Amino acid sequence: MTARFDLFVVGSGFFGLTIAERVATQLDKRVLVLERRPHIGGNAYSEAEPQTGIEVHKYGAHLFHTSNKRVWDYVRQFTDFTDYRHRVFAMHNGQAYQFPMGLGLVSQFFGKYFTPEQARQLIAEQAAEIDTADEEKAISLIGRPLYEAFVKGYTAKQWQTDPKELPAANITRLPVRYTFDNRYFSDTYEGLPTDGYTAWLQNMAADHRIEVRLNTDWFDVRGQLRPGSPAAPVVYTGPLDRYFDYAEGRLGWRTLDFEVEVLPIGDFQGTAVMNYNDLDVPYTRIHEFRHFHPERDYPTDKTVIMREYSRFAEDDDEPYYPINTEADRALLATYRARAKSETASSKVLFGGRLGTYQYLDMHMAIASALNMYDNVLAPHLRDGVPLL
Amino acid sequence: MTARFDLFVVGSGFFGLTIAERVATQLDKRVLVLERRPHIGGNAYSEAEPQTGIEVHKYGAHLFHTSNKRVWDYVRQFTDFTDYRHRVFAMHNGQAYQFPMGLGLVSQFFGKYFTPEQARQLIAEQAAEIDTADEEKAISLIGRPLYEAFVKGYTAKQWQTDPKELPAANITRLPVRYTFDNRYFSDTYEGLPTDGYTAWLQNMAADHRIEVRLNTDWFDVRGQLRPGSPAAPVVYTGPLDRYFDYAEGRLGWRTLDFEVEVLPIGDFQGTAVMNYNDLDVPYTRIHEFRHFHPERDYPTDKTVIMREYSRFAEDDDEPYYPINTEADRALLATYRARAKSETASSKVLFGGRLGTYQYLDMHMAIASALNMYDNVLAPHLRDGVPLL
Numbered sequence: 001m002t003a004r005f006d007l008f009v010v011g012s013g014f015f016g017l018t019i020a021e022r023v024a025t026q027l028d029k030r031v032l033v034l035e036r037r038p039h040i041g042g043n044a045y046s047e048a049e050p051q052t053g054i055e056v057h058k059y060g061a062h063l064f065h066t067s068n069k070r071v072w073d074y075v076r077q078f079t080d081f082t083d084y085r086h087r088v089f090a091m092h093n094g095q096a097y098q099f100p101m102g103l104g105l106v107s108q109f110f111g112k113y114f115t116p117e118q119a120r121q122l123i124a125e126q127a128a129e130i131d132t133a134d135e136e137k138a139i140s141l142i143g144r145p146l147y148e149a150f151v152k153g154y155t156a157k158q159w160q161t162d163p164k165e166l167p168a169a170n171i172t173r174l175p176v177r178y179t180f181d182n183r184y185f186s187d188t189y190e191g192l193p194t195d196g197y198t199a200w201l202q203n204m205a206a207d208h209r210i211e212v213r214l215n216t217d218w219f220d221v222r223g224q225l226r227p228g229s230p231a232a233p234v235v236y237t238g239p240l241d242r243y244f245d246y247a248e249g250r251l252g253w254r255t256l257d258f259e260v261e262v263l264p265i266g267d268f269q270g271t272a273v274m275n276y277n278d279l280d281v282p283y284t285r286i287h288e289f290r291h292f293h294p295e296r297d298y299p300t301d302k303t304v305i306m307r308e309y310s311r312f313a314e315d316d317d318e319p320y321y322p323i324n325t326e327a328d329r330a331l332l333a334t335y336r337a338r339a340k341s342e343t344a345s346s347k348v349l350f351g352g353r354l355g356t357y358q359y360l361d362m363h364m365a366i367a368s369a370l371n372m373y374d375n376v377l378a379p380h381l382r383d384g385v386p387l388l
Numbered sequence: 389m390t391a392r393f394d395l396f397v398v399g400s401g402f403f404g405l406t407i408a409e410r411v412a413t414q415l416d417k418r419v420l421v422l423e424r425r426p427h428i429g430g431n432a433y434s435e436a437e438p439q440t441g442i443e444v445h446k447y448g449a450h451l452f453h454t455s456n457k458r459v460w461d462y463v464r465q466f467t468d469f470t471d472y473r474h475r476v477f478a479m480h481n482g483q484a485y486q487f488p489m490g491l492g493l494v495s496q497f498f499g500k501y502f503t504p505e506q507a508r509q510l511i512a513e514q515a516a517e518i519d520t521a522d523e524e525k526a527i528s529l530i531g532r533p534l535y536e537a538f539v540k541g542y543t544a545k546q547w548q549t550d551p552k553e554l555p556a557a558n559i560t561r562l563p564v565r566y567t568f569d570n571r572y573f574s575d576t577y578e579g580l581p582t583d584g585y586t587a588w589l590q591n592m593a594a595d596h597r598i599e600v601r602l603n604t605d606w607f608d609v610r611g612q613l614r615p616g617s618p619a620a621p622v623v624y625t626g627p628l629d630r631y632f633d634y635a636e637g638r639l640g641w642r643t644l645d646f647e648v649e650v651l652p653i654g655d656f657q658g659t660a661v662m663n664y665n666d667l668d669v670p671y672t673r674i675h676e677f678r679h680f681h682p683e684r685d686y687p688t689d690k691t692v693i694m695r696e697y698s699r700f701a702e703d704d705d706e707p708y709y710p711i712n713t714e715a716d717r718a719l720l721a722t723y724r725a726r727a728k729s730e731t732a733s734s735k736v737l738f739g740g741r742l743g744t745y746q747y748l749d750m751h752m753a754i755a756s757a758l759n760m761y762d763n764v765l766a767p768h769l770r771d772g773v774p775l776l
C-alpha cells in the first residue's frame with residue numbers, strides 16, 4: 001500500500017516545525033503538520049497590528065537567545081537576526097529601577113552608591129535575617145527589603161497565591177549582580193528575527209514536502225489519517241494529560257491574558273518591557289512593541305502596548321507554565337509511563353513543552369527537536385531502528 | 389640623485405600610521421615615521437600593567453566607534469574587535485546615576501518615574517527659566533536642577549574655569565534622551581581591539597617599507613634627513629604653532645593628568661568608566677580597565693584603576709583638547725596661511741589633531757588620513773600632480 005505521508009507532526013510551534021523541517025529536507029519525506037489554532041507558530045506567533053503596522057507578539061514578548069552554535073547556525077537558514085539586546089526595567093512605588101538586581105537597583109533603592117564589595121556585604125547582612133536552611137527562602141537569599149519590594153508582589157501576581165504559601169523548593173538561587181551590567185540575558189547570541197517570527201515560522205514550513213493543516217485538532221482527524229499512512233510515526237507536541245483523556249487527573253498549569261491597546265502617543269514607556277512589581281497593579285508586565293524594532297520605520301504619533309496578566313488556568317484555558325507541585329510530578333511520572341507504551345504500540349513520540357510538561361524557551365525547544373531527530377526519529381525513518 | 393625615503397611622517401598616532409601604511413603598501417614607497425615619544429601610537433597607546441597584567445590605556449579611555457563602513461573595513465585588516473558596548477555612569481552626591489541624561493537619570497534624580505511625554509514637559513518647564521536667545525546657555529537648554537547636579541561641577545573641573553566665565557556659544561545643544569536607552573555611542577560599529585591598541589598600531593607599521601624611529605623629534609633631525617631624500621614630502625602631525633616657532637603666539641590647550649593605582653580587590657566600581665560630577669572631587673573620571681575586556685582571564689583578586697584630572701596646560705604640558713577661544717581661532721587662521729605657504733615652498737602637509745588644532749576621534753583621524761591619501765598625497769606620489 002502506497003502511503004500518503006511519511007510522518008505526522010501534531011503542533012506547529014518551534015519543536016514541531018523543527019521536527020517537520022529536518023525530516024522533510026534531510027530524509028526527503030512527506031510530513032503533515034496538524035495545528036489546531038487559526039495560524040502557525042504556537043506561542044511564538046506574531047502579527048502586525050492594523051492601525052499602526054507594528055509587529056506584536058500575540059502571546060507575550062518572545063526574545064531569542066542561545067549559546068548553542070548549532071542552534072544559531074540552524075535558525076539563520078530561515079531568518080536574519082537583528083542586533084537587539086534585551087534590557088528590562090521594574091516599576092515599584094512610582095519609580096522605575098534598573099533590573100535585574102545589581103549595583104544599579106541596589107544604589108537606587110537604598111538611596112546611595114554601593115561599591116561591588118559594599119554591596120556584597122549589604123546583601124549578606126540582610127539575607128542573614130533568615131537562614132536558608134530553616135515569606136520565604138527568598139528573604140534568606142536577598143534580604144527582607146529587596147524581597148518585599150521586587151519579588152513578593154511580582155511572585156504573588158504570577159502564581160496567584162500568597163508567597164508564604166508556595167514551596168521553598170521553588171527557588172534555588174536568587175542572585176544579585178555585583179556589577180552595573182544590566183544585559184538581561186547572558187548567552188553568546190541574541191536578537192530578534194529581522195522580518196518577525198511569523199516569516200521565520202513560514203520559512204521553516206515552506207518546503208513542498210511539508211503540509212500544514214490549520215484549524216485542525218489531531219484528536220478529530222487521527223482516525224481518518226493514519227489508515228492511509230499506517231507506518232508513519234506521530235510526533236505529538238500537544239498536552240500530555242489531554243493525550244490520555246485525563247484518565248489519571250489533570251496536570252496543573254498557569255495562563256496569561258493579554259490586553260493589547262493602541263495609544264494616540266509615540267512612546268508609552270521608553271523601553272520594550274516594564275515589570276510591575278506591586279500587588280496593587282493587576283498586570284505583571286507592559287510590553288511596548290515599537291522598541292523591539294527601532295530599526296523599522298514605525299509611525300511616531302501612535303504606539304501599541306500589551307498588558308500581560310497571570311491567573312489560575314481553568315480547564316479550557318491555554319496552558320503556559322507548569323505549576324509543578326509534588327502531586328503534579330507523580331501525575332507526570334504516571335503519564336510518562338503511559339507515553340512509553342504508546343511509543344512501543346503506536347509509534348507516537350512525545351515532545352515540546354506541552355508533550356513533556358516543562359517550560360522550554362525557543363532555543364531549548366529547537367535543540368530538543370534536533371536531539372529527538374538525531375537520536376530517535378532519523379534512525380527509525382532512514383535505517384530500521386526501533387523508536388524505543 | 390638616489391633617495392633614501394619616499395615620504396616622511398611626523399608622529400605615529402592613528403592619522404600618521406594610516407598615511408604611512410597606505411603609502412608603503414598601496415604605492416610601494418619607503419616611509420620614515422619620526423616619533424618623539426618612546427613608543428608608537430600617540431595617545432591611543434596601551435600597555436600591560438606589571439602587577440595584574442591588565443591592559444591600561446595610558447592617555448585615557450579609548451573606545452572605538454564608527455558609522456563609516458570604509459573605515460570599519462580598513463581597521464579590521466589590522467585587528468579584530470570585541471562586542472563591548474560603552475556605557476557611562478555618573479557620580480553625584482554619593483549616588484550613581486545612569487548616563488547620559490535620559491529617562492533613567494531623570495527618574496533617579498527626581499525620585500519618581502516620568503513617562504517619555506512627562507519628561508519632555510518637565511524639561512520644557514525647567515529650561516523656561518532662561519531663554520536661550522538672551523550658570524549658562526546650559527540652564528536655558530535643560531533647566532537649573534540638572535545643570536547644577538550633572539553639568540556645572542563637571543565643566544568646571546574640565547575647563548578649570550567657573551562656567552559663569554565661559555562662552556555661551558561653547559554649547560550648541562544639550563539633549564535629554566526621552567527613552568531608557570543608555571548606550572553611550574550612536575554609531576553602527578563599535579568595539580575594543582581584541583589584542584589591544586598597541587598590537588593594532590604595531591600591525592599598521594609592520595610593513596618592511598615603513599621605518600619608525602622612536603625618541604626622535606622632527607625639529608632635531610629634519611636638517612639631516614631632507615637632503616638625502618629631497619623630493620619626499622613631509623606629513624607633519626605635531627602642534628601647528630610649534631612648527632612655526634610660536635612666532636605668532638601660542639594656541640590654547642587643556643591637559644590631563646592620569647593617576648594609575650593597583651588595588652588589592654577584584655572590582656572597584658563595577659563598570660569601565662565613572663564620571664565624577666562634583667567640584668569637591670579633584671578628578672574628573674575613574675576608569676577601571678578589567679571592564680574593557682571581560683572576555684580576558686584577568687585576576688579576581690586585583691584590579692587597576694585610573695583617575696583622570698583636568699588642568700590649565702602650561703607651556704611644557706602635553707596638549708589634549710583645544711581651548712578654542714575666539715583668539716585661538718584668529719591665531720589658527722594665521723597659522724593655516726603659514727601652513728599653506730609651507731606646502732607650496734617645501735612640500736609639508738599638516739594633518740591630525742595637533743597639526744590641525746582640532747579634537748579628533750580615532751575613526752575621524754583615520755577617515756581624515758584616507759582623505760589626504762586619496763585626494764592629495766597618492767596623486768602626487770603616483771603621478772606627479774601638485775600637492776595644493
Ligand SMILES: Cc1cc2nc3c(=O)[nH]c(=O)nc-3n(C[C@H](O)[C@H](O)[C@H](O)COP(=O)(O)OP(=O)(O)OC[C@H]3O[C@@H](n4cnc5c(N)ncnc54)[C@H](O)[C@@H]3O)c2cc1C
Nearest residue numbers: 011013014015036042043060062063218238352353361362
Ligand atoms: C508568555 C510566553 C513568552 C515567551 N517568551 C520567550 C522568550 O522570550 N524567549 C524564548 O526563547 N522563549 C519564550 N517562550 C517559549 C516559546 O513560546 C517556545 O517556542 C515554546 O514554549 C516551546 O515550543 P513548542 O513547539 O514545544 O510549544 P508551542 O509553541 O506551544 O507549540 C504547540 C502547538 O501545538 C498545538 N497543539 C496543541 N494540541 C494540539 C492538537 N491536539 N492538535 C493540533 N495542534 C495542537 C498548539 O495549538 C500550538 O500551536 C515564551 C512562551 C510564552 C508562553
Ligand SMILES: Cc1cc2nc3c(=O)[nH]c(=O)nc-3n(C[C@H](O)[C@H](O)[C@H](O)COP(=O)(O)OP(=O)(O)OC[C@H]3O[C@@H](n4cnc5c(N)ncnc54)[C@H](O)[C@@H]3O)c2cc1C
Nearest residue numbers: 399401402403424430431448450451606626740741749750
Ligand atoms: C583623553 C583622551 C581620550 C580619548 N578617547 C577617545 C575615544 O574614546 N575614542 C576615540 O575615537 N578617540 C579618543 N581619543 C582621540 C585619539 O587619541 C585619536 O587617535 C587622536 O586624537 C587623533 O589621532 P592623531 O594621530 O591626530 O593624534 P596623536 O595620537 O596625538 O598623534 C600625534 C603624534 O605625533 C607625535 N609628535 C608631535 N610632534 C612631534 C615631533 N615634533 N616629532 C616627532 N613626533 C611628534 C606625538 O608624540 C604623537 O605620537 C582620545 C584622546 C585623548 C587624549
